[PDB]
């Protein structure tokens, strides 16, 4: 045949295009000129296709790939069909075990560069010079669900970064909240068992809203801090581009003089912090369970590269015990009001992978993979993680040679006396496979530690204690950080936390677990406890009403850096606006709308009651991106309704529903000319309302008003009004 | 200790109860008196819990299952903590590869019995006497999505039955529509690749609504029949109890005299045929991605046993 | 540091050197200028060592590769030691499952070239042009034992050849005998279980001399033909360089016009056929269980490259039923007297691998791997093999991407829609992973069958019959081929067959199995059966004595091509002679001996009672290779004793034993001057005897005589005399 | 785990303890034991925290390491006493 069309419409343009303009494709075909040392080094295993003959894996050309070999055209298939058997066998063996946690994830390639040399505090080569660029590979993920679960669940998110440094791979394997649920790695199977689907029936997926999770939390108050972050809007990010990242544990930075400095790692999203609202997130898991995966991929194809600032909280070794919390306790955060985040460098994700399985699914990150200039601490959760990644990757990725899988390979040299193992790629020519050896003059050889290019030596921390299985008494405080978090949130963020706990505990079948969680909230803050209790039909006791609130954290009664929205940081580039078309669109409005959006890097999606095209007043042919039902308001940041023949869409139920949903979800809406007739559906004032942009036409200040609302993300003042709308 | 409440409300009643009345539980605890030969034969590997000491896998009692062994209560974790290492090791290796297709599925135990002896057309032992009961294990599934994807997607459903007969295991591995998309098994990897998530970005999950599926369909008209069924409300069943089942292929029955009879296998839902509507099914993928799994489980806990002829 | 010596004696010369002259080494270091297309394409995975730092697999330099990280120098090891954990983990996972059969094997690289274009009979591209060179990788093996078992056991040998052709990989997976034990693949697990170590105790290794094997054989007379070959000296080859190879099955050759020709594949050893004798092979299993592996590696390092001529027996389609046996029956051979072997091309093995595990142990051959121009037949052993190799290789090599392990990769192009699988190396950029597709204009595309570069199409053989599990009546004849083999053997080869059966059946514990085997031998030949029975204390019945011998094969009462030795083909290049020195060797004799050996490509190993050196009469310092006991006569082809101070070695028990062993095992012996005193230890007459070269000095005709004996391999006329020697 | 195929090698007959073994570990390739415990974690109230930890004691007690005193720096160094 064949039938790719004559117009060449099958193939997407190899240039940045806005979401939905062209079919997506493998990164190296979408952006062939985007390169980095790692992307180039993968060239040996990239496999093309065009102009090549179809063959078996042994290189034999196939003549007929449509039929098995049989004795007669209606006869039995013959065992000698080696073509069919290789093809079916490889298909039969396609799947590998998904990760134990973080199985649902989306990744991209990029690069990192420090703003200045950090040689006074660390000898890490990748932070030693502002013009030294280090390729990275980043994988973002949910945490509980399987690899086929949905993106916009309520859950913690993983944020893992593989740095291909000149002195080794450093993996920074963090999450989107600055603490973890538990204190010691020994409890990790217990916690993860409690949050994952229950064992009898394997329900629920991607949800902590079930009895065993809340049983565990209620019995293990150390979890309450991260639970508070998960119940807030932090648990439902708008995009991986708009959430923070944290390494959680205190690590060490080691300089050339041997000085150790404690450090906690942060990633700041340069697109700003932004989250969905629960009803929107939950409905989006049904409308588009691949929303975050798609959003990341389309941002990079559009040139809206995710950018993050690496930042360090630095504490001198002499200040280890100066806080009212233990620095080694992963359930405690270090307030930025106490220890500021120093900016360190920028990370840009600018290329999607070519093959998700080969590059994303087989990537292996490990917090153990550190480099000279970095070291660990005794945090008891970090200590046990050091054992687990290595162990799980051998079974997940089939053997001990997972570092030879292309995405995992260092770009710098690697030489040692390790040999064999399943799927061994490297063919070693060294005469010796042991050291010391004389037969190869002891090569490859050990290298002493030094200021640069030196071997790894651990910091010589003094260890003094008996061999004990004991929690440090300093870790036995569970309510002051949850309280600090609570008081740092805005009133509307506090309401959403309450709503999250209420919704989750309403799904817990055993009422006494609900009551025990409420009792724990009474140890954090009474207003919080009472608001959740009222939603659960629970009444606090007199004793509960008199629980003394936990102490402030080093005199802090709040830290605004813990809130998503108290300090504006809203950027609109990369956001999307739905434009609800009609069959006689006033092109003056459309011109003005698209020009204003284009100027700020905001994308548009043209919607209608059907697919195809509609023609504007002026004759302009407009292509329809999707239908009102086909691409609901859940997927956009704002909605504009231009003037024209509004009767065409005024009696359309889907069109009205579109605005009711967007209104409920606090998204800015802009109506021009006769589009103002839609105000009745969303029942608000004859004279108007903050959050609803309206004018006779879409001109000068109309688009400016709409853009200012989008920079603020959502219209929080509309909260009290949304409860009367049936949406 | 003593974390359970003194009114015993942690434990669900061991008697049929309506959906939502009691917490769900393992079948043998919820219905200890429901038995069959296969269920009885699994007793040798069933492991209890109550009143036993917590141990390693080698039988060593654990004293402190809350902490790793370290040098000092704020010190480094020690390599000799064999208890931590067994526990983390087993956790680290919990997962196995999901099924290539039909990775999302929900299953139950039951039994079969023929209405009358079918010896005139087949010598299969399990079809030879109305009083002969055959334990079964049935797994229903979606077809495209992974094991963690949602139940009420638009897709073909699998309906697989393992009959534990006295002359061997017979597995009847069918779907909820009477035909399949393709004609020759050589094309199965092509079709499946086309319907599954696209390879550059692995989207979309649980959906045939993407370009590669329709490209393949457009190029292979043999697919149109099953496509018609999938696009109908057949592709969004109300429950596994309310859909039909088919073996699809023509098989043979062979009687004692050696006569072969062509046969196609069917399962009729005794609860009747019933499907959702698209907007409902898609929204239900978001509000309860485990809706069919939950519905199956709770119907059985309530005594509303799924029955098929 | 500095472990290597200053004289550079740790490093072997990168030039051809005789066995034992230099330490052996990886092939690319030993022979860097030897190349072929496959060796060159492996360069991307070869890893060096000299002048590089020692690192983890992630690229981090190691400073101390001698110690674990601990709390205090006498303290507990710390979980955070990621360097120790990676190194120990990779060691812990070094082994993979051995092959189910042919686990013990030795391999080398080389090349093949046809003598002329065979386009008239086959369109296979690698046989299309005399100038077309095809790289090969060949693995020879025993069949029963584990990878750690001994080389010189009595067993069939595997001979597998991977051809890296321009139109795909062609694997020719043969054995050193022209038939197999069984007729249908369904019984392979039964046969292999019977031959392998018994299941209760896992004894015996590398031996078919145990009850279950002979039980099976006695019950399944189809096995008798191959058992005859295995009991002959064919089951104990001198080296892989001196055995034959066969494809066994009838396959097909397909030309451009579509004509099918039946073909059986053969390999002829250009060094000639040669085998050990049983006592020598058994003792060598103890002294040097790696004898064949060492002999192959050392021959290539010396430039004595193994050479084999590929040959075809061709039968026209219309002659399928012209013989007394079925061409599809793999327990039947095609006598060369009926169908000559046509010479096709030459194969030369000229480079050893770099890493045994990576290249040899992970190599995967499959008889299924054919190319356009070749096809299968209905042989029911071959048919079942087509299924098995695919299946076993996935578990053995870890997944469905074993074709990406370097040694298995094709050198020609390979492109298809297969994806994923554990350890996926290739990163596919095709936008499509299915066909037919329009999104990549249907590439990679199928190719029609044609005269060259065409897609594979099976020959359209007519199939007619019911679906049955039934053996063809034509295969139900079991004794005529065993009888033809027996009658084709020399008298001393016949005696060795008798002795094989007798030794093996003496180790069968259940006497009735021995008796049943003797009864089977009575159906093949009465002389054979009575000679085995007399060694077992079994007396044939009158009925056994009157069993009619089976018919001749197509009129043939013998075929000399079935004998190892009936038609001389002895070459001496590559063979070794032990020279037994004394403390005052006569230099004149040594000069002449070495020069004559050197001129024919025969190696020498200078032996003495101790290591070090000895000084010859004229001051020549003579380096000692090994001692009389450290390098027994088992390892050499002949023994020369030069003149000098014979008293120094005449009272040496080890020296005398050296000659008694060599004598017993039929090796040529040459004694010069006072060395003739050793004649009494081997009880040879005063006058002399054929096979013992003697003179006053070692020159003119003495070396010619010895080399003439070496060309005839062993001294068969001395068999009657070796019985009286206590050795 | 790689030699014997997964983390349930303790269920291979020759390796099995003859004494009781109960805990919250689940799944893994070739899982033989079918756990009926409502809970797969601890602490839990839904099975009244069983199976439960046991204090160390004279007999039938839980395992507790001997409280050896550790005092030193983190070092990759051979004791001089071993030289
Ligand atoms: C501060 C606490 C933790 C953080 C921030 C964290 C973060 C993550 C992330 C982001 C991933 C996915 C990396 C990827 O995208 O492939 C991951 C995977 C994983 N984590 Fe951790 N995790 C933490 C605690 C733990 C603990 C305590 C353990 C066990 C002791 C653990 C065991 C695992 C395992 C087994 C995997 C799967 C790795 C693989 O298959 O390649 N995690 N974790
Ligand atoms: C009439 C057409 C087909 C039907 C009705 C069918 C039905 C099913 C069902 C219901 C399952 C899941 C069983 C379970 O619940 O575990 C399944 C699994 C599977 N199907 Fe089929 N299928 C069909 C065609 C095919 C074809 C043509 C192939 C390949 C040649 C194939 C390969 C597989 C594989 C590899 C699995 C996973 C099995 C496992 O991992 O246990 N299917 N199929
Ligand atoms: C004419 C009869 C046969 C011949 C000449 C033959 C020859 C060989 C040889 C030479 C090897 C080792 C290849 C290497 O060096 O890696 C081998 C391996 C093997 N053979 Fe065959 N064999 C025969 C019959 C069979 C049959 C009938 C079966 C099964 C139905 C079979 C199954 C195997 C398997 C499973 C392996 C191991 C393959 C691997 O792990 O890569 N063989 N055979």
List the helices and strands and how they pair.
The structure is cut from a larger assembly and holds four copies of chain A.
Chain A: H1 27-30, H2 37-41, E1 46-47, H3 82-92, E2 105-114, E3 134-141, E4 158-165, E5 168-175, H4 188-195, H5 211-219, H6 224-231, E6 245-246, E7 251-254, E8 260-269, H7 278-287, H8 291-302, E9 307-316, E10 341-351, H9 356-361, E11 374-375, H10 380-396, E12 427-428, E13 462-468, H11 480-488, H12 491-506, H13 511-522, H14 526-536, H15 542-545, E14 576-580, H16 587-599, E15 603-608, E16 613-615, E17 621-623, E18 626-627, E19 638-641, H17 647-650, H18 653-664, E20 669-672, E21 692-695, H19 700-711, H20 719-722
Parallel strand pairs in A: 14-15, 14-19, 15-18, 19-20, 20-21
Antiparallel strand pairs in A: 2-3, 2-10, 3-4, 4-5, 6-8, 7-8, 7-11, 8-9, 9-10, 16-17
Helix pairs in contact in A: 4-5, 5-13, 6-11, 12-14, 13-14, 16-19
Bound molecules: protoporphyrin IX containing FE (3 copies).
Subunit structure (chain B): Homotetramer.
Active site (chain B): 102, 175
Family (chain B): Belongs to the catalase family. HPII subfamily.
């Amino acid at each position: 045949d064949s039938l790719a069309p004559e117009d060449g419409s099958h193939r997407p343009a190899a240039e940045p295009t806005p979401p939905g303009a062209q079919p997506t494709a493998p990164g190296s075909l979408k952006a062939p000129d985007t390169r980095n040392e790692k992307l180039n080094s993968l060239e040996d295993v990239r496999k093309g296709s065009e102009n090549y003959a179809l063959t078996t894996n042994q290189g034999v050309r196939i003549a007929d790939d449509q039929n098995s070999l049989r004795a007669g055209s209606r006869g039995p298939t013959l065992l000698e069909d080696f073509i069919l058997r290789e093809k079916i066998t490889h298909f039969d063996h396609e799947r590998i075990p998904e990760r134990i946690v973080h199985a649902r994830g989306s990744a991209a390639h990029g690069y990192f560069q420090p703003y200045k040399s950090l040689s006074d505090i660390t000898k890490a080569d990748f932070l030693s010079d502002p013009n030294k660029i280090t390729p990275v590979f980043v994988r973002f993920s949910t945490c509980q669900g399987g690899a086929g679960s949905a993106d916009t669940v309520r859950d913690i998110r993983g944020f893992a970064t593989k740095f291909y440094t000149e002195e080794g791979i450093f993996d920074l394997v963090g999450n989107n909240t600055p603490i973890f649920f538990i204190q010691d790695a020994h409890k990790f199977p217990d916690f993860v068992h409690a949050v994952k689907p229950e064992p009898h029936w394997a329900i629920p997926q991607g949800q902590s809203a079930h009895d065993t999770f809340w049983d565990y939390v209620s019995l293990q108050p150390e979890t309450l801090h991260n639970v508070m972050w998960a119940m807030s809007d932090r648990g439902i990010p708008r995009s991986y581009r708009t959430m923070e990242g944290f390494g959680i544990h205190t690590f060490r930075l080691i300089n050339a003089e041997g000085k150790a400095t404690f450090v906690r790692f942060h990633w700041k999203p340069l697109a700003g912090k932004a989250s969905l609202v629960w009803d929107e997130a939950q409905k989006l898991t049904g409308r588009d369970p691949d929303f975050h995966r798609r959003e990341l991929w389309e941002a990079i194809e559009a040139g809206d590269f995710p950018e993050y600032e690496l930042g360090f909280q630095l504490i001198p070794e002499e200040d280890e015990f100066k806080f009212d919390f233990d620095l080694l306790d992963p359930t405690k955060l270090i307030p930025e009001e106490l220890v500021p985040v120093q900016r360190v460098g920028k990370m840009v994700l600018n290329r999607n992978p070519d093959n998700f399985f080969a590059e994303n699914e087989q990537a292996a990150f490990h917090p153990g993979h550190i480099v000279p200039g970095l070291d660990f601490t005794n945090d008891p959760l970090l200590q046990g993680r050091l054992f687990s990644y290595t162990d799980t990757q051998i079974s997940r990725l089939g053997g001990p040679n997972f570092h030879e899988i292309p995405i995992n390979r260092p770009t710098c040299p690697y030489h040692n006396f390790q040999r064999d193992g399943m799927h061994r790629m490297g063919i070693d020519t060294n005469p010796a496979n042991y050291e010391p050896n004389s037969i190869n003059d002891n090569w490859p050889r050990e290298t002493p530690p030094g200021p640069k290019r030196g071997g790894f030596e651990s910091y010589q921390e003094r260890v003094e204690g008996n061999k004990v299985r004991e929690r440090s008494p300093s870790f036995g405080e569970y309510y002051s950080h949850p309280r600090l978090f609570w008081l740092s949130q805005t009133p509307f963020e506090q309401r959403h936390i309450v709503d999250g706990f209420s919704f989750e505990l309403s799904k817990v079948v055993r009422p006494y677990i609900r009551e025990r969680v409420v009792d724990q909230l009474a140890h954090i803050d009474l207003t919080l406890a009472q608001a959740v209790a009222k939603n659960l039909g629970i009444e606090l006791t007199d004793d509960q009403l008199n629980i003394t609130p936990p102490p402030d954290v080093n005199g802090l009664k709040k830290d605004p850096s813990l809130s998503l929205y108290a300090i504006p940081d809203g950027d609109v580039k990369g956001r999307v606006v739905a434009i609800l078309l009609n069959d006689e669109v006033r092109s003056a409005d459309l011109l003005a709308i698209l020009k204003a959006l284009k100027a700020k890097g905001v994308h548009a999606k043209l919607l209608y009651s059907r697919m195809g095209e509609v023609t504007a007043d002026d004759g302009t042919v407009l292509p329809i991106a999707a239908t009102f039902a086909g691409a609901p308001s859940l997927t956009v940041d704002a909605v504009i309704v231009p003037c024209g023949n509004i009767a065409d869409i005024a009696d359309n139920g889907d069109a009205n529903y579109y605005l009711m949903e967007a209104y409920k979800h606090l998204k800015p809406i802009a109506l021009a000319g006769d589009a103002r007739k839609f105000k009745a559906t969303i029942k608000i004032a004859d004279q108007g309302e903050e959050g609803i942009v309206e004018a006779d036409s879409a001109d000068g200040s109309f688009m400016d008003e709409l853009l200012t609302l989008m920079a603020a993300h959502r219209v929080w003042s509309r909260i009290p009004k949304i409860d009367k709308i049936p949406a």
